[PDB]
C-alpha cells in the first residue's frame, strides 16, 4: 500500500508540476509560495523557504506533513476553530497550511474547496492523497473520499480511471 501510494503521488506531482511552478513564478508573497511547494508535495523546500522568509515555527510545523500523526491533526484543527471564532485576523495562507495539517482540507470548516476554481482537480486530489489521512484509509476509499467532494469533468479520462479505481465495490 505504501509503495503504490508513493508512486501514485510522485506521478500526480509529475503532472501538476508545471501548473504549480508557473503559479510560484507569479506569486508576490512568500507564505503563498510555501503553500505551493506543499502543492508539489515538497515538504522540504516549504520548510526551507519558511526558514528563509523567517517563518520558522511554521517551518517546524511543515515537517509533519506526510506523517499522519493524529495528535497534530486534532491540534491543527483546534487552532483553526479558535481562529474561526474571534481570531481577529490570520494570514490567508497560514490558515491554508494549518488546514493541510488538519488532514481534511476540503472535508472541513476552513475549507480549501474554493481552490476548486484556482487549481487542476488533480492538484487538489494530490492534497487529499498526500495529507488527507493516508494510514486510516485504503488508497481506494481515500480517493473516493476526495471524489465525493468534487465532480470531475465527464469527458476527462484520467478522471475516469480514478473513479473506476475508487469505485472498487
Amino acid at each position: 500500500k505504501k509503495e503504490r501510494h508513493c508512486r501514485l503521488t510522485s506521478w500526480i506531482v509529475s503532472q501538476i508540476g508545471p501548473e504549480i511552478e508557473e503559479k510560484i513564478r507569479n506569486s508576490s508573497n512568500e507564505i503563498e509560495q510555501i503553500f505551493l511547494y506543499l502543492l508539489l508535495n515538497d515538504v522540504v523546500r516549504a520548510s526551507k523557504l519558511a526558514i528563509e522568509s523567517k517563518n520558522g515555527h511554521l517551518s517546524v510545523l511543515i515537517s509533519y506533513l506526510g506523517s499522519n500523526d493524529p495528535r497534530i491533526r486534532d491540534l491543527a484543527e483546534l487552532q483553526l476553530q479558535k481562529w474561526s471564532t474571534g481570531g481577529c485576523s490570520i494570514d490567508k495562507n497560514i490558515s491554508k497550511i494549518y488546514k493541510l495539517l488538519s488532514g481534511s482540507p476540503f472535508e472541513g470548516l476552513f475549507s480549501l474547496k474554493e481552490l476548486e476554481s484556482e487549481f487542476s482537480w488533480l492538484c487538489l486530489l494530490n492534497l487529499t492523497l498526500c495529507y488527507g489521512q493516508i494510514d486510516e484509509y485504503s488508497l481506494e476509499s481515500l480517493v473516493q473520499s476526495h471524489l465525493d467532494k468534487f465532480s470531475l469533468p465527464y469527458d476527462d479520462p484520467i478522471g475516469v480511471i480514478f473513479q473506476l479505481y475508487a469505485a472498487n465495490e
Partner: protein
C-alpha cells in the same frame, strides 16, 4: 540524635551478610543518605544547609552507582536484532542503543542527570489564550508564531513577550528534566499548539506493521520519517534571533546542539554536562544512520557537526568550565564512576592517607563503596586498599564511641583477628 548516621550504613551491611541482590546495599545507602539529606535540611543551623547538600549529593552518587553497575554487571546477554534496509529509522536507533553499550551508558547517565534536575513551579495566572494582548491591541494580521518573524518584532505587545518568556523558560526546564509528557501537556493546555507540535517531532519513525520487532509497544505508526530534515529545521529555527532565548534554547537541545549563551551561562556542572552528553548522543545516532543509508540526501539541508566527543573529553571540558563544582570530592567520584576509573580512584584516595581527612563524608563513602564493589565484583578493589580503608574508618567508629558495630566491618579480612 543525627550522629546515628553510621548505624544506618552499618545496619544495611548487617542485613546483607545475614540473609545467606547485593545491589540492594547501595540502594539502601542511597535512601539512607537521602533520609539524612532531609534531616539536616528541614529545620537547621545555616551551617547545616552545607552538609545537607553534601548528603543530597551523597545520595545522587549512590543512585548513579546503582544504575551503572546494575547495567554493567547484571549484563546477561540477550538476542541480537536483525534489521533490514526496509526497516524504519526508529528500529535502527533501537538497534544502536542495544548493540553499543558504551553509548547506552551515556543514555543511563543522562537519565540520572535528568532525574536530579530542578524545575520551577508551574506558572500561575496563565492567560486564557495566546498573544491575547497583541490581538486585542489590533495589529496581528496573522495569528501564527512566525508572523512577527516575517516582519519586525515590534508587532508583539510587551506583556505577550513577557508571557512567552515565562512559558518557554518553563518548557525548557521541563525538557531538561526529562518531563516531555508534561511539556506536551503544558503546550496543549496553554494554547501553544504549534510549539506542542514542534515537541512531537522528537520521535524517530516506527511502523508496528513494518518494524515487526516492536509490534508489541505500538499499535499504530508514529514518529516522523524525514527526521534529518526536522532536525536541521529545528536547529535553523534555533539560530534565528528575535525569538525568546529559552525558545532558542529548547530548539538547540532538540537539535543536539548547545544552547545560546544567555541561557547556557546559568547551567551548572550537571546541566552543562547533560547538554554535552545530549550532543554526543544526537551526533552518534545520526552518524549510525548515515553509515546504514537510512538518511536521504535531500534532508541534509544544513551542516551539523559530525564529530562526537568522548565522555572523557566532555567531562574534561565541562570540568574546566566549572572547576569549583568539578573539584567537589563526591562529584569526582561521580565522574570516576561514569568513566569506570573507580577502583582507580579508590586506591588513589587511599594514598591520600599516607585533605581527605578534612571532609567527613569522604572516608566513609569510599570505604562502603569499596565494600559494595568487592561484594558485587569479587576482586574489584585491591585487598590491601580494603584493609587500609576499613582500618581507618574503624578507628573513627572508635573515636565516635560506636564499638558496638565494628564486627560487621571486620567480615573482610583475617586481619580481623587483630581486634
Amino acid at each position: 540524635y543525627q550522629t546515628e548516621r553510621f548505624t544506618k550504613f552499618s545496619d544495611t551491611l548487617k542485613e546483607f551478610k545475614i540473609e545467606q541482590d547485593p545491589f540492594n546495599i547501595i540502594r539502601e545507602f542511597r535512601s539512607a543518605a537521602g533520609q539524612l539529606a532531609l534531616d539536616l535540611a528541614n529545620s537547621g543551623d545555616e551551617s547545616n544547609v552545607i552538609s545537607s547538600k553534601d548528603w543530597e549529593l551523597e545520595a545522587r552518587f549512590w543512585h548513579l552507582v546503582e544504575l551503572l553497575l546494575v547495567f554493567r554487571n547484571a549484563d546477561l546477554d540477550l538476542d541480537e536484532m536483525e534489521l533490514h534496509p526496509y526497516n524504519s529509522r526508529g528500529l535502527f536507533e533501537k538497534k544502536l542503543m542495544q548493540d553499543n553499550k558504551q553509548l547506552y551508558q551515556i543514555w543511563i547517565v543522562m537519565v540520572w542527570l535528568k532525574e536530579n534536575t530542578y524545575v520551577m513551579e508551574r506558572p500561575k495566572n496563565v492567560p486564557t489564550s495566546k498573544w491575547l494582548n497583541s490581538i486585542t491591541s489590533g495589529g496581528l494580521k496573522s495569528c501564527d508564531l512566525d508572523f512577527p518573524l516575517r516582519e519586525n518584532t515590534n508587532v508583539l505587545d510587551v506583556k505577550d513577550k513577557e508571557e512567552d518568556h515565562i512559558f518557554f523558560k518553563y518548557i525548557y526546564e521541563l525538557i531538561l528534566a526529562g518531563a516531555i509528557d508534561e511539556a506536551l501537556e503544558e503546550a496543549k493546555l496553554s494554547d501553544n499548539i504549534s510549539i506542542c507540535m514542534i515537541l512531537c517531532g522528537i520521535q524517530e519513525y516506527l511502523n508496528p506493521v513494518i518494524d515487526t520487532q516492536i509490534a508489541n509497544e505500538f499499535n499504530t505508526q508514529q514518529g516522523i520519517k524525514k527526521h534529518s530534515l526536522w532536525r536541521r529545521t529545528v536547529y535553523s529555527l534555533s539560530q534565528q534571533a528575535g525569538l525568546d532565548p529559552y525558545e532558542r534554547a529548547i530548539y538547540s537541545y532538540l537539535s543536539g546542539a548547545i544552547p545560546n549563551q544567555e541561557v547556557l551561562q546559568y547551567s551548572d556542572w550537571e546541566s552543562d554536562l547533560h547538554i554535552h552528553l545530549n550532543q554526543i548522543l544526537q551526533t552518534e545516532i545520526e552518524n549510525y544512520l548515515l553509515e546504514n543509508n537510512q538518511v536521504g540526501t535531500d534532508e541534509l539541508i544544513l551542516p551539523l557537526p559530525s564529530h562526537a566527543l568522548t565522555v572523557q573529553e566532555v567531562l574534561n571540558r565541562v570540568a574546566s568550565r566549572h572547576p569549583s563544582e568539578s573539584e567537589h570530592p563526591i562529584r569526582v567520584l561521580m565522574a570516576s564512576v561514569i568513566l569506570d576509573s573507580l577502583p582507580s580512584v579508590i586506591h588513589s584516595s587511599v594514598e591520600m592517607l599516607l585533605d581527605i581527612i578534612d571532609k567527613p563524608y569522604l572516608l566513609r563513602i569510599v570505604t562502603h563503596l569499596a565494600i559494595c564493589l568487592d561484594i558485587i565484583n569479587p576482586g574489584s578493589v585491591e585487598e590491601v586498599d580494603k584493609s587500609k580503608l576499613i582500618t581507618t574508618y574503624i578507628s573513627l567508629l572508635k573515636l565516635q564511641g560506636l564499638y558496638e558495630n565494628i564486627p560487621i566491618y571486620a567480615t573482610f579480612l583475617n586481619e580481623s583477628d587483630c581486634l
